[PDB]
Write a protein that binds this DNA or RNA. Structure first.
Lengths: 143, 143
DNA sequence: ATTGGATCCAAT
DNA sequence: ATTGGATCCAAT
Protein backbone atom coordinates (compact mmCIF):
# COMPACT_ATOMS: atom_id res chain seq x y z
CA UNK A 1 0.00 0.00 0.00
CA UNK A 2 1.18 3.47 -0.93
CA UNK A 3 1.01 6.78 0.88
CA UNK A 4 1.48 10.50 0.16
CA UNK A 5 2.51 13.04 2.80
CA UNK A 6 0.62 16.35 2.66
CA UNK A 7 0.92 19.47 4.82
CA UNK A 8 -1.98 20.35 7.10
CA UNK A 9 -4.58 21.80 6.82
CA UNK A 10 -4.70 20.59 3.20
CA UNK A 11 -4.13 16.98 4.25
CA UNK A 12 -7.34 16.75 6.29
CA UNK A 13 -9.28 18.70 3.64
CA UNK A 14 -8.31 15.97 1.15
CA UNK A 15 -9.56 13.07 3.27
CA UNK A 16 -12.78 14.98 3.98
CA UNK A 17 -13.36 15.67 0.28
CA UNK A 18 -13.31 19.47 0.69
CA UNK A 19 -10.07 19.72 -1.32
CA UNK A 20 -10.55 17.63 -4.46
CA UNK A 21 -7.10 17.71 -6.11
CA UNK A 22 -3.47 17.73 -5.00
CA UNK A 23 -0.78 19.46 -7.07
CA UNK A 24 2.85 18.33 -7.34
CA UNK A 25 5.90 18.99 -9.51
CA UNK A 26 6.19 15.29 -10.48
CA UNK A 27 4.14 12.55 -12.13
CA UNK A 28 3.07 9.18 -10.78
CA UNK A 29 1.62 6.22 -12.70
CA UNK A 30 0.01 5.07 -9.45
CA UNK A 31 -3.76 4.67 -9.66
CA UNK A 32 -6.25 3.51 -7.07
CA UNK A 33 -6.10 3.77 -3.33
CA UNK A 34 -3.57 6.29 -2.00
CA UNK A 35 -3.20 6.74 1.73
CA UNK A 36 -2.80 10.31 3.00
CA UNK A 37 -0.45 11.18 5.89
CA UNK A 38 -0.05 14.62 7.40
CA UNK A 39 3.53 15.89 7.50
CA UNK A 40 5.00 17.03 10.80
CA UNK A 41 4.69 20.72 9.84
CA UNK A 42 2.07 22.37 12.09
CA UNK A 43 -0.02 25.15 10.49
CA UNK A 44 -0.65 28.45 12.23
CA UNK A 45 -4.22 28.96 13.48
CA UNK A 46 -4.60 31.93 11.11
CA UNK A 47 -3.37 29.84 8.17
CA UNK A 48 -6.16 27.42 9.06
CA UNK A 49 -8.71 30.23 9.35
CA UNK A 50 -7.73 31.83 6.03
CA UNK A 51 -7.86 28.48 4.20
CA UNK A 52 -11.22 27.68 5.80
CA UNK A 53 -12.56 31.07 4.67
CA UNK A 54 -11.38 30.40 1.11
CA UNK A 55 -12.98 26.96 0.93
CA UNK A 56 -16.29 28.29 2.25
CA UNK A 57 -16.30 30.62 -0.75
CA UNK A 58 -15.38 27.78 -3.13
CA UNK A 59 -17.77 25.15 -1.69
CA UNK A 60 -20.57 26.84 0.31
CA UNK A 61 -20.94 28.85 3.51
CA UNK A 62 -21.92 25.74 5.54
CA UNK A 63 -19.05 23.34 4.73
CA UNK A 64 -18.15 21.18 7.73
CA UNK A 65 -14.45 21.41 8.51
CA UNK A 66 -12.62 19.00 10.82
CA UNK A 67 -12.31 20.36 14.33
CA UNK A 68 -8.59 19.50 14.39
CA UNK A 69 -5.81 19.23 11.79
CA UNK A 70 -3.43 16.74 13.46
CA UNK A 71 0.17 16.57 12.23
CA UNK A 72 2.47 13.59 11.75
CA UNK A 73 -0.21 10.91 11.47
CA UNK A 74 -2.03 8.72 8.93
CA UNK A 75 -5.37 10.36 8.15
CA UNK A 76 -7.24 8.22 5.65
CA UNK A 77 -7.13 7.64 1.92
CA UNK A 78 -8.43 8.62 -1.50
CA UNK A 79 -8.71 6.91 -4.87
CA UNK A 80 -6.17 8.48 -7.22
CA UNK A 81 -8.16 8.37 -10.47
CA UNK A 82 -5.75 10.32 -12.67
CA UNK A 83 -2.50 12.26 -12.56
CA UNK A 84 -3.14 15.03 -15.09
CA UNK A 85 -0.78 17.58 -16.51
CA UNK A 86 -1.78 21.18 -15.87
CA UNK A 87 -2.98 21.37 -19.50
CA UNK A 88 -5.21 18.29 -19.17
CA UNK A 89 -6.46 19.59 -15.82
CA UNK A 90 -7.64 22.86 -17.35
CA UNK A 91 -9.29 20.90 -20.16
CA UNK A 92 -11.08 18.30 -18.06
CA UNK A 93 -12.04 20.15 -14.86
CA UNK A 94 -12.73 23.76 -15.90
CA UNK A 95 -14.82 24.45 -12.79
CA UNK A 96 -12.00 23.59 -10.37
CA UNK A 97 -8.90 24.08 -12.54
CA UNK A 98 -8.14 27.30 -10.64
CA UNK A 99 -7.66 25.17 -7.50
CA UNK A 100 -4.19 23.95 -8.55
CA UNK A 101 -1.48 25.55 -10.71
CA UNK A 102 0.97 22.66 -10.25
CA UNK A 103 2.72 20.88 -13.16
CA UNK A 104 0.85 17.66 -12.32
CA UNK A 105 -2.54 17.44 -10.61
CA UNK A 106 -3.71 14.38 -8.69
CA UNK A 107 -7.44 13.77 -9.15
CA UNK A 108 -8.88 12.31 -5.94
CA UNK A 109 -12.20 10.50 -5.50
CA UNK A 110 -13.92 8.48 -2.74
CA UNK A 111 -12.17 10.12 0.26
CA UNK A 112 -12.22 8.18 3.53
CA UNK A 113 -11.12 9.56 6.91
CA UNK A 114 -9.82 7.36 9.75
CA UNK A 115 -11.50 7.87 13.11
CA UNK A 116 -8.29 6.88 14.94
CA UNK A 117 -5.21 8.48 13.32
CA UNK A 118 -1.93 6.64 13.89
CA UNK A 119 1.45 8.43 14.28
CA UNK A 120 3.69 8.04 11.25
CA UNK A 121 6.92 9.44 9.80
CA UNK A 122 6.65 10.28 6.11
CA UNK A 123 8.86 10.30 3.04
CA UNK A 124 8.98 12.26 -0.24
CA UNK A 125 6.67 11.46 -3.16
CA UNK A 126 4.68 8.18 -3.05
CA UNK A 127 6.05 5.83 -0.43
CA UNK A 128 5.26 2.35 0.85
CA UNK A 129 3.28 1.95 4.06
CA UNK A 130 4.57 -0.38 6.77
CA UNK A 131 2.38 -3.48 6.98
CA UNK A 132 1.47 -3.14 10.65
CA UNK A 133 0.17 0.42 10.34
CA UNK A 134 -1.60 -0.40 7.06
CA UNK A 135 -3.31 -3.39 8.69
CA UNK A 136 -4.62 -1.21 11.52
CA UNK A 137 -5.79 1.53 9.15
CA UNK A 138 -7.72 -0.97 7.04
CA UNK A 139 -9.47 -2.30 10.17
CA UNK A 140 -10.21 1.27 11.29
CA UNK A 141 -12.08 2.06 8.08
CA UNK A 142 -14.31 -1.03 8.47
CA UNK A 143 -16.00 0.26 11.63
CA UNK B 1 37.33 51.39 33.78
CA UNK B 2 35.34 51.23 30.57
CA UNK B 3 35.31 48.74 27.72
CA UNK B 4 34.00 48.47 24.15
CA UNK B 5 33.15 45.15 22.48
CA UNK B 6 34.31 44.84 18.85
CA UNK B 7 33.94 41.99 16.37
CA UNK B 8 37.08 40.15 15.29
CA UNK B 9 39.22 40.55 13.24
CA UNK B 10 38.72 44.32 13.67
CA UNK B 11 39.09 44.07 17.46
CA UNK B 12 42.68 42.78 17.31
CA UNK B 13 43.55 45.20 14.50
CA UNK B 14 42.55 48.04 16.84
CA UNK B 15 44.78 46.94 19.73
CA UNK B 16 47.66 46.42 17.28
CA UNK B 17 47.22 49.89 15.78
CA UNK B 18 46.56 48.59 12.25
CA UNK B 19 42.96 49.83 12.38
CA UNK B 20 43.06 53.41 13.66
CA UNK B 21 39.37 54.32 14.07
CA UNK B 22 36.17 52.58 15.11
CA UNK B 23 32.79 53.64 13.70
CA UNK B 24 29.47 53.49 15.56
CA UNK B 25 25.93 54.83 15.23
CA UNK B 26 26.12 56.59 18.63
CA UNK B 27 28.21 59.20 20.45
CA UNK B 28 30.17 58.91 23.68
CA UNK B 29 31.66 61.71 25.79
CA UNK B 30 34.17 59.19 27.13
CA UNK B 31 37.79 60.19 26.60
CA UNK B 32 40.99 58.46 27.62
CA UNK B 33 41.67 54.80 28.12
CA UNK B 34 39.09 52.46 26.57
CA UNK B 35 39.53 48.73 26.94
CA UNK B 36 38.77 46.60 23.88
CA UNK B 37 37.05 43.20 24.15
CA UNK B 38 36.37 40.86 21.26
CA UNK B 39 32.75 39.80 20.90
CA UNK B 40 31.90 36.10 20.79
CA UNK B 41 31.28 36.21 17.01
CA UNK B 42 34.00 34.15 15.26
CA UNK B 43 35.10 35.41 11.82
CA UNK B 44 35.49 33.08 8.86
CA UNK B 45 39.10 32.43 7.79
CA UNK B 46 38.35 34.06 4.41
CA UNK B 47 36.88 37.13 6.12
CA UNK B 48 40.20 37.37 7.95
CA UNK B 49 42.18 36.91 4.73
CA UNK B 50 40.18 39.51 2.80
CA UNK B 51 40.50 42.07 5.60
CA UNK B 52 44.23 41.36 5.89
CA UNK B 53 44.61 41.88 2.13
CA UNK B 54 42.78 45.22 2.36
CA UNK B 55 44.91 46.51 5.23
CA UNK B 56 48.13 45.55 3.45
CA UNK B 57 47.00 47.86 0.65
CA UNK B 58 46.09 50.63 3.11
CA UNK B 59 49.20 50.33 5.33
CA UNK B 60 52.02 48.54 3.46
CA UNK B 61 52.75 45.08 2.08
CA UNK B 62 54.73 44.07 5.20
CA UNK B 63 52.26 44.88 8.00
CA UNK B 64 52.51 42.37 10.85
CA UNK B 65 49.11 40.88 11.64
CA UNK B 66 48.35 38.91 14.81
CA UNK B 67 48.62 35.18 14.26
CA UNK B 68 45.24 34.63 15.96
CA UNK B 69 42.04 36.66 16.36
CA UNK B 70 40.61 35.22 19.61
CA UNK B 71 36.93 35.76 20.38
CA UNK B 72 35.18 36.49 23.66
CA UNK B 73 38.17 37.90 25.53
CA UNK B 74 39.72 41.18 26.71
CA UNK B 75 42.42 42.15 24.22
CA UNK B 76 44.02 45.40 25.34
CA UNK B 77 43.15 49.07 25.21
CA UNK B 78 43.41 52.34 23.31
CA UNK B 79 43.21 56.01 24.22
CA UNK B 80 39.95 57.40 22.87
CA UNK B 81 41.11 60.90 21.89
CA UNK B 82 37.93 62.08 20.17
CA UNK B 83 34.50 60.91 19.10
CA UNK B 84 34.00 62.78 15.82
CA UNK B 85 30.94 63.08 13.67
CA UNK B 86 31.37 61.81 10.12
CA UNK B 87 31.64 65.44 8.97
CA UNK B 88 34.42 66.28 11.44
CA UNK B 89 36.15 63.01 10.56
CA UNK B 90 36.31 63.91 6.87
CA UNK B 91 37.60 67.37 7.81
CA UNK B 92 40.28 66.32 10.28
CA UNK B 93 41.60 63.00 8.91
CA UNK B 94 41.33 63.27 5.10
CA UNK B 95 43.93 60.53 4.56
CA UNK B 96 41.96 57.90 6.50
CA UNK B 97 38.41 59.27 6.34
CA UNK B 98 37.52 56.55 3.82
CA UNK B 99 38.20 53.97 6.56
CA UNK B 100 34.87 54.63 8.33
CA UNK B 101 31.47 55.79 7.03
CA UNK B 102 29.78 55.59 10.44
CA UNK B 103 27.77 58.46 11.98
CA UNK B 104 30.35 58.77 14.78
CA UNK B 105 34.03 57.83 14.52
CA UNK B 106 36.16 56.94 17.54
CA UNK B 107 39.73 58.22 17.16
CA UNK B 108 42.12 55.77 18.84
CA UNK B 109 45.73 56.41 19.87
CA UNK B 110 48.39 54.58 21.92
CA UNK B 111 47.12 51.00 21.35
CA UNK B 112 48.29 48.36 23.81
CA UNK B 113 47.77 44.60 23.41
CA UNK B 114 47.60 42.18 26.35
CA UNK B 115 49.89 39.16 26.12
CA UNK B 116 47.43 37.06 28.17
CA UNK B 117 43.83 37.64 27.04
CA UNK B 118 41.17 36.93 29.68
CA UNK B 119 37.70 35.50 28.83
CA UNK B 120 34.93 38.07 29.14
CA UNK B 121 31.25 38.51 28.28
CA UNK B 122 30.49 41.88 26.71
CA UNK B 123 27.65 44.39 26.61
CA UNK B 124 26.41 47.03 24.14
CA UNK B 125 28.08 50.43 23.80
CA UNK B 126 30.62 51.48 26.49
CA UNK B 127 30.37 49.28 29.55
CA UNK B 128 32.06 49.04 32.93
CA UNK B 129 34.78 46.44 33.47
CA UNK B 130 34.61 44.18 36.51
CA UNK B 131 37.33 45.12 38.99
CA UNK B 132 39.00 41.71 39.17
CA UNK B 133 39.50 41.40 35.41
CA UNK B 134 40.58 45.05 35.14
CA UNK B 135 43.15 44.53 37.91
CA UNK B 136 44.65 41.56 36.07
CA UNK B 137 44.70 43.38 32.73
CA UNK B 138 46.52 46.35 34.26
CA UNK B 139 49.16 44.01 35.72
CA UNK B 140 49.47 42.23 32.36
CA UNK B 141 50.35 45.45 30.56
CA UNK B 142 53.15 46.23 33.06
CA UNK B 143 55.26 43.23 32.04
C1' DA C 1 26.41 41.69 24.05
C1' DT C 2 24.55 37.64 24.76
C1' DT C 3 21.11 34.52 24.46
C1' DG C 4 18.10 30.88 22.75
C1' DG C 5 13.67 30.34 20.18
C1' DA C 6 12.30 30.61 15.23
C1' DT C 7 13.35 29.93 10.69
C1' DC C 8 16.31 28.63 6.80
C1' DC C 9 18.90 25.10 4.54
C1' DA C 10 20.83 20.88 2.53
C1' DA C 11 21.58 15.88 2.89
C1' DT C 12 24.32 12.62 -2.42
C1' DA D 1 9.95 13.62 4.83
C1' DT D 2 12.65 14.25 8.39
C1' DT D 3 16.45 15.92 10.51
C1' DG D 4 19.60 18.99 12.95
C1' DG D 5 23.33 22.39 11.92
C1' DA D 6 23.43 27.30 10.41
C1' DT D 7 21.49 31.59 10.42
C1' DC D 8 18.01 35.05 11.61
C1' DC D 9 15.67 37.57 15.14
C1' DA D 10 14.15 40.12 19.22
C1' DA D 11 14.44 40.83 24.23
C1' DT D 12 11.20 46.15 26.96
Amino acid sequence: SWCLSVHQPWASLLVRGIKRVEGRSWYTPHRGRLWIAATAKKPSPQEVSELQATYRLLRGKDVEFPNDYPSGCLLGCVDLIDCLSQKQFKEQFPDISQESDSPFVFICKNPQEMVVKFPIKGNPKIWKLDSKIHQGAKKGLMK
